[PDB]
Design a protein around this ligand. Structure first.
Ligand code: NA
Length: 171
């Protein structure tokens, strides 16, 4: 059966216990931790593309008050739908399964200024989602997996000094 497993789940859970934060900038910022998954149960002979997007978690924004994240207001209109294509795409099932699939180069941004960046709203929570798209398929089969351990709030600057310190410790 198709299995897509989060790598470094214990590391992601250390960030999630604090409430994870990812910086967004005009020119875009790489994630830490990096989203990496292990894959089994693809057809080794078939070709697939791997896509990444970010699903809005809430109908409200967040704010960091007295050392705690709390509901912070009505949300901004939804960020434009941005999909990141994994640069190894398209590739054989065997390629994707032989070693973990790393999204190390995706950049998160708060400005539509190109470069295959993912636009996110500051102070909104997002959950990474990976899609596996089968190549040459008249039915356009897609599979989608969500990674709850990897939820984070987009920020222009770290709010929680424990997150600032964890990012330095593990990166
Ligand atoms: Na753009």
């Amino acid at each position: 059966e198709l299995r897509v497993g989060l790598e470094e789940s214990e590391l992601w859970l250390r960030f999630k216990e604090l409430t994870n934060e990812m910086i967004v900038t005009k020119n875009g910022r790489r994630m830490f931790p990096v989203l990496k998954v292990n894959v089994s149960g693809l057809d080794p002979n078939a070709m697939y593309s791997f896509l990444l997007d970010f699903v809005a978690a809430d109908n409200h924004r967040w704010k960091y008050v007295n050392g705690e994240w709390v509901p912070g207001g009505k949300p901004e209109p939804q960020a434009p739908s941005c999909v990141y294509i994994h640069p190894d795409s398209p590739n054989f099932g065997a390629h994707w399964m032989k070693a973990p699939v790393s999204f190390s180069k995706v950049k998160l941004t708060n400005k539509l200024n190109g470069g295959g960046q993912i636009m996110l709203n500051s102070l909104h929570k997002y959950e990474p989602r990976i899609h596996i798209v089968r190549v040459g398929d008249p039915q356009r089969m897609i599979t989608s997996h969500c990674f709850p351990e990897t939820q984070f709030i987009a920020v222009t600057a770290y709010q929680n000094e424990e997150i600032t310190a964890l990012k330095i410790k593990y990166n």
